[PDB]
Amino acid sequence: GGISEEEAAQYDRQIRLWGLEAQKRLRASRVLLVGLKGLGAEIAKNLILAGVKGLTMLDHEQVTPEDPGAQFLIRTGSVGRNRAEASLERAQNLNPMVDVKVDTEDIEKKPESFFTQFDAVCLTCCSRDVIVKVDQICHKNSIKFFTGDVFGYHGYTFANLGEHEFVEEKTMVKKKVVFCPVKEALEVDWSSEKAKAALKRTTSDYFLLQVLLKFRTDKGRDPSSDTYEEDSELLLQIRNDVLDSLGISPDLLPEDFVRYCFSEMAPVCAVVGGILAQEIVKALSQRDPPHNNFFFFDGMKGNGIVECLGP
Amino acid sequence: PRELAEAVAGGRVLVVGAGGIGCELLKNLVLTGFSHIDLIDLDTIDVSNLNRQFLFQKKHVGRSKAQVAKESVLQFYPKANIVAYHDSIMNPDYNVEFFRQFILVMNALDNRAARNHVNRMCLAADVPLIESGTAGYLGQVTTIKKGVTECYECHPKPTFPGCTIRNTPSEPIHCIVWAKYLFNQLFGEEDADQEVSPDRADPEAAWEPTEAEATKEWAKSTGYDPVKLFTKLFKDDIRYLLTMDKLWRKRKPPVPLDWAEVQSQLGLKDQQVLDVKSYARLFSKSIETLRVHLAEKELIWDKDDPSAMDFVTSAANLRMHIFSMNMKSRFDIKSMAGNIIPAIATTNAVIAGLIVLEGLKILSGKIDQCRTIFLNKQPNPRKKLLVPCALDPPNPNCYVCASKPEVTVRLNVHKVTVLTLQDKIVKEKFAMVAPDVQIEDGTILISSEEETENNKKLSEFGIRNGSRLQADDFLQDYTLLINILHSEDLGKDVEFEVVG
Amino acid sequence: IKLKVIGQDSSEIHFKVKMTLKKLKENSLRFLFEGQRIADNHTPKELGMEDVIEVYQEQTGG
Numbered sequence A: 001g002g003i004s005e006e007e008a009a010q011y012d013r014q015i016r017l018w019g020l021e022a023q024k025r026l027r028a029s030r031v032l033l034v035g036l037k038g039l040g041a042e043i044a045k046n047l048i049l050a051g052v053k054g055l056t057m058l059d060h061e062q063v064t065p066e067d068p069g070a071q072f073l074i075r076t077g078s079v080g081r082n083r084a085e086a087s088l089e090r091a092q093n094l095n096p097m098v099d100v101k102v103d104t105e106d107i108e109k110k111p112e113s114f115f116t117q118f119d120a121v122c123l124t125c126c127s128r129d130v131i132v133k134v135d136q137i138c139h140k141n142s143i144k145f146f147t148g149d150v151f152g153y154h155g156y157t158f159a160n161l162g163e164h165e166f167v168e169e170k171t172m173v174k175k176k177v178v179f180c181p182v183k184e185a186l187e188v189d190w191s192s193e194k195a196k197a198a199l200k201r202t203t204s205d206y207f208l209l210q211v212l213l214k215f216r217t218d219k220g221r222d223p224s225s226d227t228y229e230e231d232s233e234l235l236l237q238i239r240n241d242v243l244d245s246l247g248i249s250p251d252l253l254p255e256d257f258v259r260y261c262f263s264e265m266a267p268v269c270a271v272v273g274g275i276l277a278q279e280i281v282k283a284l285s286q287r288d289p290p291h292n293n294f295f296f297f298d299g300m301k302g303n304g305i306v307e308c309l310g311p
Numbered sequence B: 001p002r003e004l005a006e007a008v009a010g011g012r013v014l015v016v017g018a019g020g021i022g023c024e025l026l027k028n029l030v031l032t033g034f035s036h037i038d039l040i041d042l043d044t045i046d047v048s049n050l051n052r053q054f055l056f057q058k059k060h061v062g063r064s065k066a067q068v069a070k071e072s073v074l075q076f077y078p079k080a081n082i083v084a085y086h087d088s089i090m091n092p093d094y095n096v097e098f099f100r101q102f103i104l105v106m107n108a109l110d111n112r113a114a115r116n117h118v119n120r121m122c123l124a125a126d127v128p129l130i131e132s133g134t135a136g137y138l139g140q141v142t143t144i145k146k147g148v149t150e151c152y153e154c155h156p157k158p159t160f161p162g163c164t165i166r167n168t169p170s171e172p173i174h175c176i177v178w179a180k181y182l183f184n185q186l187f188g189e190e191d192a193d194q195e196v197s198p199d200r201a202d203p204e205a206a207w208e209p210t211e212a213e214a215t216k217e218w219a220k221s222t223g224y225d226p227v228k229l230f231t232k233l234f235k236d237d238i239r240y241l242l243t244m245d246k247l248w249r250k251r252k253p254p255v256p257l258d259w260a261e262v263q264s265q266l267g268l269k270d271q272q273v274l275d276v277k278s279y280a281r282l283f284s285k286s287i288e289t290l291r292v293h294l295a296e297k298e299l300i301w302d303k304d305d306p307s308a309m310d311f312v313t314s315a316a317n318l319r320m321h322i323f324s325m326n327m328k329s330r331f332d333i334k335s336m337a338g339n340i341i342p343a344i345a346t347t348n349a350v351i352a353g354l355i356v357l358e359g360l361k362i363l364s365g366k367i368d369q370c371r372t373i374f375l376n377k378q379p380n381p382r383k384k385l386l387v388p389c390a391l392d393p394p395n396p397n398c399y400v401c402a403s404k405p406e407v408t409v410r411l412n413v414h415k416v417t418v419l420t421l422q423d424k425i426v427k428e429k430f431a432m433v434a435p436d437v438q439i440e441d442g443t444i445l446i447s448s449e450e451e452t453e454n455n456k457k458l459s460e461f462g463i464r465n466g467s468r469l470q471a472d473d474f475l476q477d478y479t480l481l482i483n484i485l486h487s488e489d490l491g492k493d494v495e496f497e498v499v500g
Numbered sequence C: 001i002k003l004k005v006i007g008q009d010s011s012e013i014h015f016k017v018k019m020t021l022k023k024l025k026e027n028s029l030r031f032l033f034e035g036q037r038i039a040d041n042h043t044p045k046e047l048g049m050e051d052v053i054e055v056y057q058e059q060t061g062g
Ligand SMILES: *NS(=O)(=O)OC[C@H]1C[C@@H](Nc2ncncc2C(=O)c2cc([C@](C)(O)c3cccc(Br)n3)cs2)[C@H](O)[C@@H]1O
Pocket: B016, B017, B018, B019, B020, B021, B022, B040, B041, B042, B043, B065, B087, B088, B089, B090, B108, B109, B110, B111, B113, B114, C061, C062
């Protein structure tokens, strides 16, 4: 059709799932991914295999000694190399049909015009301040915005697809779903009787995220298992302050949560990266209802929950 | 944590399958710190694999999946210890002692028969098994542990009448199945259940209620001549069919096709539906190729052999035409004939991540916290996209994992051969791989070592409504007692039945 | 009670049964109510059923 014979042969098993028109939409789409750590590498791998037009992998950090000894896009012994540069050869090789590019400059320093070339932006390991900034830029220019992160056994994804139209098989029917800004999503008011009732059925993973975002804001990094005792102590204090601040019992997040939220566990990257990449695919292809607006994963319980928070 | 890390760096694990789930799972195990892995897969890499089997690139097409998966992993982690087997897990080299090597087995299979075998091996060896599967956007994981959980076969698991295929097709699938049957009749193992000629004894045909109540040779003798086959199949047979006047009182008669008459009549290429002439030409072309191939190497039908696939496409579309149905694209027919499961990277990635999380809980001595986890496409009413459920205890009535299991089978002991018992019943229905059947009477009936060949009606051995058989699979370390009932009111198409 | 069975593919059915479950579920499916597996001899009364039953098939690809 509008794809070559080689592409039809390669993409055969997914064209049989989502159709040739959806595959053609992916083929036209360019994605920015920020952060090439465990979760970012999974997302990159899934998007590149799916056959997007292009993926720009942006990371300004070096591979460090504390980074895992095994990383599937990075050769062992790359301590000190820029992480996106270190990821480029293996990532490109997953799918030569995709234009895979590297950017080594800090996302914070990027002008608003840098974003306009992309159909979707996906942020991993970024600060709350950065998430809000880029979501605002994406809303201006109608760009699909995603963020996600993993912490120990837990992980999350968030989407802001603005006013999002798609088709779904009942024959296709066209539907619309409306998302809110990430600032609203992260700053829910738990005062009203309505909110107080919502809270009963809200996963505590949403407060976990608030605690971990504030750690990242306060420390400039995430909790690390090398500084477990030091980081555990501060996380407990942040739990107290964050929850007290929202008028919620600190005990909604159990006291031993610190045992389960450290480091990047590869299977958690795979789950969270699989869910996030597939939402990107759905959003780009405008096929099937996207999760509105948070997915929370707890790998101890095997729970994966979709919460609509913000409005 | 120390104990768990030591278990993981210590012991040895087995991954059965190096495909969509298997490649993801191999990666996750290595990055999680599993320092000794064995990986088995019997297949070679195909271009259709490359949208989701990310350890394989185009240059690897035609090499062993398992061997390439290992090579690819060693490029990002040289210290991994991986053993790759280019082999089937069904091979008797993989005996109970082989399985006992492992602290954990993980399935990454795409069919039930192999999963049944692995279930039995893990029960025999008393090694925990993580079972999993995917299809499209959906999938699931679960843990199997002898004496603690249901086994893979504790619950019953989820078919065309001969006469609807041979005489009265009304759906494209009937025509597709007919063409597969035709391919096997012409070039494959001649099976009696795959007859393609009109059925001369069909209840709907018979006028009185007393009677209603009750191919390769020929193609060989023509040199596999396309035109002669076309006429026999698309002309001669249809006219014969039109004999059976009762059939066509109700429904649209089929319309026979004549070779010379036919000869003088967007999405992907393969998604186009061609005209009758083109399929008739494809049919001819494909036969001439297949006959040539049947001289170098009976053939086995494979959706990925262009000629075999073209044969089935053309034959089914001509038959569709004859019975006044719209013809179908090669792309559609490939799905249906090949039973292709649509598949993508993300579903397999999620399932593989869950496999390892379940594995960690097992090896951490926390099996009480293991779950069956379903992956949904959309959240359930409790907002759950991944739905965990507690593990169930062994089913006391399971025909596999119970103490001394027994089943009951109703057949006709006078018309059922000893080959049908080995193949349709003990091998296929009950999933034994290397079986040994003998009568319960103080009389070896089937032997593992191929002996016997019997392959004689059953009643000619001292077998009647009440006899009992002792089927062993020593490889599977599994014994099943089969109780026979006899009957003659089974059905035109039901040759045996497992009594429930 | 009117009950809703909902399958993975979003197939929504309105059933209608009496509160005193093998007949409702009418063997390639497993049936759940808010987390818990539905036995053949389960009753709505026994389960606190007013609602929605979820159905799950085992996939065999990989
Ligand atoms: N889901 S996927 O298709 O992406 O990947 C699945 C993976 C499973 C693997 N199959 C396999 N691997 C190891 N051992 C056995 C198997 C089998 O599935 C089977 C082998 C047989 C027998 C009886 O050995 C057989 C039957 C018919 C032909 C042949 Br040759 N052998 C039965 S089932 C697939 O290759 C794939 O990579």
